[PDB]
A = this chain, B = another copy of it.
Amino acid sequence: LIPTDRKQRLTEHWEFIRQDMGSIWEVMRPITGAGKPETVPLWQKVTLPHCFNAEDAVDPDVNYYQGPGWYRTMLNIENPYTNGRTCLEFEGAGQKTEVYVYTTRIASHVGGYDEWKADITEAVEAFRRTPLCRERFGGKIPIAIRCDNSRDTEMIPSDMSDFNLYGGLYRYVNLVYTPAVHFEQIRIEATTDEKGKQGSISIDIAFGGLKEFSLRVFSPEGKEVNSISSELSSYQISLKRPQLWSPHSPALYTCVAELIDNGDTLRTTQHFGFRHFRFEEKGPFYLNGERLLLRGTHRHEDHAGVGAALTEEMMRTEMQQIKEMGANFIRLGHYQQSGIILRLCDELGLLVWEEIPWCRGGLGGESYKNQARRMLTNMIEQHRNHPSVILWGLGNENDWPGDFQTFEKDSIRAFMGELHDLAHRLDPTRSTAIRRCEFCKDIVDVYSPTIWAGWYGRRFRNYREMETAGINATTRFLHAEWGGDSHAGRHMEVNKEKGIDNFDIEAADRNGDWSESYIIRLFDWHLKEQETMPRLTGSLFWTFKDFSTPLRPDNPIPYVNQKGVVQRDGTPKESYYVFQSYWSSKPMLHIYGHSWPVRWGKPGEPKEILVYSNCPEVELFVNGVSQGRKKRNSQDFPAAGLRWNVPLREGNNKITATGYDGKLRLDDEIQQEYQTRTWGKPSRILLTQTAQDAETILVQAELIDENGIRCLDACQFIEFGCTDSEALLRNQGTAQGSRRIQAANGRASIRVNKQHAPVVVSASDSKRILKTALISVSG
């Protein structure tokens, strides 16, 4: 990662093909004529970032592609510094990568997630001394990059992992010029006492190549705190009463380094923050001396339609959405993530646990270990400036065997100790962590076991017991990963009849209906319990967003881990507002059931209604009749005391809530049908055009019994087809962008691109027991 503020993202005018080529010459050779043998195979025009698996990760019928691919482009290289260096900078590419200038290989890399670079200065110059350069390419420089994500047992992470080992140039590639002498590494170590009285900055600058260079520090308010003019170094300064960075107040200082030479100015701007943190033995966690409850989530480098190839603008939206939920903490999946995410965590205010991808499978040979050592090193060195980061993780579920014939707790223990020592040698400032490896729990500073209350183990009401069992089983405890799957749009009516009700069950993984109705209770319970555990460090629920995993072909959305509170395209589930009503300080108000169109029960039966709100008082209205203004109280489960039991008319009902917080008044409204007719087994599929959009039409399939009652119970897979194989929005991994998807209360919908109309859309049950239904979509 070159330190400079001037960089060009290479996003346009790339070609890509998803296979290996016969040689670099085959990649580079000229085309002698149309239809000649070298004009196949065909390449694709693509824009970067690009991912091999943008679609096939969630395609229900194929294994996501794991193999080589090539990219190529023509670059206009104009290094404006005399004797300047020219680099291609990779913010991230998976999994193995080779870089060529014309026919000469420049650099190679193993590792999907660290940053690295390729100095092309010499190859470029050499290419310019040949006639081919201007006679054939007209000045430009031919560049080719091979990316490979073939299965490799000796490379981390393990394919046993519960996520995709994406291939491609899925993080930005930058063209970077520097002058002859330039910055190579700017390390900023800010320290402060737990009370914030004394601050100490400490800047180490490593130059490349080998007149004065300046160094300025700025306060969060832009005030030049101090300047240094020096000469070609390390450096340390005291500060009294430094403004402290916290999730609540993510205040950031700035360090500016300038090299001036030949009248041009190499500048690099960087941010850092002062904060103190402590993981109390057998106790909670303190940030700048005050106990803080870590309210944590996870994210993967994954998104609908793009696989790993997210843009900056997408990352901003998502991180902003996570901040508005009220999180103050996040574990960045199982690998180093985009520098854009880290900078967002510094800017918005989220503490960070970032780990290397030693994730399941056991332990490999020497290059395996060297990748781990290298990636830990790269992660620490590339990210250490970020105030947000407080944990360096060393591995995840390393107790999970299977990638080798042997599994050796002693060898794993030894290597884990080596990594712990390397992290502390490299960055004393922070603590180490692993998750779920009982026989290494002592090696690290902060341990997380596996605790999935009500999902994989026990009932969610056993959380507090299991949590304290964990706090007592380890020196320093953090709870990484809890929650459970919900099929967005599936709901379930409470049935107060061998358990407190139908939601009070053990291990909903294999006993639950994967409805939002259940998980909303489970999240709710956990967050209530957390209000009365003053010695808990905190926890991180897995996970923020539905994401693709190769391990779940048969999930309600195939190949999608559905443990988000938000769909894979960012569309919030109703559980999102559960977290938001407990954790956010911005007043909000959400009636549960915006995505619940039809409720059921016997005629005149009073129906439960839950509101999730951080307002202290909310009044609810049913069909215009106030049902009473109630007061928020987290202990009155569920919904923190904001629940009613109201009668519903057969057919439509209008449900309304008004929220009060001081002078502020909030409002929300849903409409729901109430169905008193009971239903038999599904008998027909009804296709409806629900209409939707200036560019999209929403098609709904409906499972009904022989007398025409919707089967609000039905979970059958439904499959969509179409006379135009590009009209359906498919392979998104979402509720309305999947071609095969389990019904949600006997219902399944899919979007149709309007510009492709007119077409015919078909809907079938996957088991092919019902008759296929057809609908004409005109536009």
Contact = CB atoms under 8 A, between A and B. Distances in A.
A403 B22 contact: yes
Interface stretch (A242-250, A418-426, A756-764): A756-764
A431 interface: no
Interface residues of A, number: 57
Contacts of A25: 153, 403-405
Contact of A151 (B21, B32, B552): B21
Interface string A5-41: 0000000000001011111011001001001111111
Contact of A22 (B22, B65, B153, B760): B153
Interface string A610-647: 00000000000000000000000000000000000000
A71 to B, nearest CB: 16
A29 B402 contact: yes
A42 interface: yes
A538 interface: no
How many copies make up the complex? 2
Interface stretch (A154-162, A269-277, A648-656): A154-162
Interface stretch (A183-191, A258-266, A462-470, A717-725): A717-725
A152 interface: yes
A63 B41 contact: yes
Interface string A138-169: 00000000000011111000111110000000
A772 interface: yes
A333 interface: no
B760 A20 contact: no
- Most chain-B Cβ atoms within 10 A of its Cβ — which of A63, A400, A550? A63
Contact of A38 (B20, B42, B160): B160
A551 interface: yes
Interface string A748-766: 0000000000111110000
Give the interface SS of chain A, mostly helix, strand, loop or mixed: loop
A553 interface: yes
Given A162-B37, A402-B37, A550-B40, A774 B67 contact: no
B37 A159 contact: yes
Contacts of A515: none
Interface in A105-150: 150
A193 B394 CA distance: 82
A37 B400 CA distance: 10
Nearest to A727: B721
A450 interface: no
A553 B40 CA distance: 8
Contacts of A38: 160, 402
B152 A19 contact: no
Contacts of A39: 551
Contact of A402 (B32, B554, B759): B32
A360 interface: yes
Nearest to A364: B23
A724 B23 CA distance: 40
Contact of A153 (B26, B35, B552, B724): B26
Contact of A161 (B37, B65, B552, B554): B37
B553 A724 contact: no
Nearest to A721: B723
A328 B153 CA distance: 55
B19 A67 contact: yes
Contacts of A153: 22-23, 25-26
Given A42-B63, A42-B553, A19 B151 contact: yes
Interface string A730-769: 0000000000000000000000000000111110000000
A177 B35 CA distance: 50
A22 B151 contact: yes
A584 interface: no
A66 interface: yes
Contacts of A67: 19-20, 67-68
B723 A760 contact: yes
A562 to B, nearest CB: 15
Nearest to A401: B32
Nearest to A31: B402
Interface string A552-577: 11100000000000000000000000
Contacts of A403: 22-23, 25-26
A769 B774 CA distance: 26
Contacts of A554: 35
Interface in A374-421: 400, 402-405
A774 B760 CA distance: 9
Given A21-B151, A760-B774, A360 B63 contact: no
Contacts of A103: 405
Given A37-B402, A63-B40, A63-B42, A722 B724 contact: no
A75 B405 CA distance: 22
A689 to B, nearest CB: 16
Contacts of A405: 25, 29, 103
Contacts of A402: 29, 32, 36-38
B63 A19 contact: yes
- What 10 A-B pairs have minimum CB-CB distances, sorted nearest first? A22-B151, A37-B160, A723-B762, A41-B63, A22-B153, A23-B153, A721-B723, A760-B760, A20-B150, A40-B550
11 contacts: A19-B63, A19-B151, A20-B150, A20-B151, A22-B150, A25-B404, A29-B402, A35-B551, A37-B402, A41-B550, A723-B760
Given A35-B554, A67-B68, 13 more contacts: A19-B66, A19-B150, A19-B151, A22-B152, A22-B159, A23-B154, A25-B153, A29-B402, A32-B402, A36-B402, A37-B360, A723-B762, A724-B762
Interface of A: 17, 19-23, 25-26, 29, 32, 35-42, 63, 65-68, 103, 150-154, 158-162, 360, 400, 402-405, 550-554, 721-725, 758-762, 772, 774
